[PDB]
Ligand SMILES: C[C@@]1(c2cc(NC(=O)c3ccc(Cl)cn3)ccc2F)CCSC(N)=N1
């Protein structure tokens with residue numbers, strides 16, 4: 322407990338492509354890079370020679386493979402995957418020194434799922450059974466890990482960000498060198514997604530003055546598998562209005578705020594200080610008590626390096642409207658060390674020791690604050 326040197330720096334990735342960890346599947350072990358996803362619950366790996374893939378699960382080479390003789394079809398809002406369910410021995414080279422029999426969805430057909438140019442071949446769904454496909458009987462990997470070993474029912478993520486991103490996934494523990502100050506915990510409202518309740522929203526300290534139910538319509542989640550801070554449409558509308566006002570020194574086209582176009586500045590001449598901080602107050606552990614997390618423009622203005630039609634420093638506005646509730650994606654998580662404390666049904670936030678900042682402002686986790694009617698901020702029906 323407290324320090325896990327061998328798990329430090331076990332995450333890699335590229336900007337806009339997510340964070341992956343090294344895993345082994347089968348006997349003898351087949352090495353795969355696997356996307357770390359707190360927004361889903363399936364362990365699903367490429368099992369066929371899709372041209373975008375560096376490598377894939379070859380079930381014929383594994384003596385420990387077992388067929389569940391069951392298919393699974395997973396459509397998303399944009400794209401799909403389809404696979405054949407089985408079990409095999411799963412290990413994490415730069416994680417705990419254990420081997421687990423886990424459910425594996427062997428991906429045999431997909432559309433807009435794998436990324437052309439990416440270095441990962443599967444997805445580690447770290448959320449709960451309730452949202453597993455096809456149903457809650459298909460035990461998620463981390464549930465299997467805890468059930469079969471003495472690994473504590475907790476993991477933590479330090480996503481570092483801005484061409485190669487890095488970070489740490491501490492399995493079964495917390496590493497105190499990864500954060501500064503104190504951890505503050507928000508209750509997991511329900512174990513399906515990592516669902517949380519946002520009780521107050523500020524832009525540069527200015528409250529948005531909305532019914533706090535709107536902040537969590539229809540849910541708020543912490544999701545390492547999403548880049549953006551995604552806000553419910555009505556919240557997004559009001560947040561951008563306030564961000565527009567706060568950043569009035571320079572004017573930008575309407576399309577930039579909708580993520581329909583990028584904005585470019587000359588190298589090193591990026592004006593961070595004209596852009597406001599964004600604060601989310603989260604439900605605390607105690608009745609009427611809350612805490613505040615605060616991110617910088619460094620988090621919500623993402624560098625886009627892939628532009629060929631431009632030679633400057635171009636950025637995407639990575640706060641976007643949503644119809645699925647608040648998604649606290651990489652835009653949030655890159656500022657913080659995030660502790661998914663499953664044993665105690667809570668999520669901890671602390672200032673990340675690796676987060677990107679200037680000399681005038683840092684990301685912050687602050688409390689305690691007094692907030693009434695926090696239970697009424699959650700959505701029902
Ligand atoms: C299963 C799903 C998903 C996520 C991804 N993520 C990424 O590619 C990515 C990219 C950048 C960053 Cl920072 C993080 N992640 C890719 C394919 C997917 F099917 C469905 C959509 S939402 C979610 N939480 N999981």
Ligand code: NA
Nearest residue numbers: 397399400433
């Ligand atoms: Na997708």
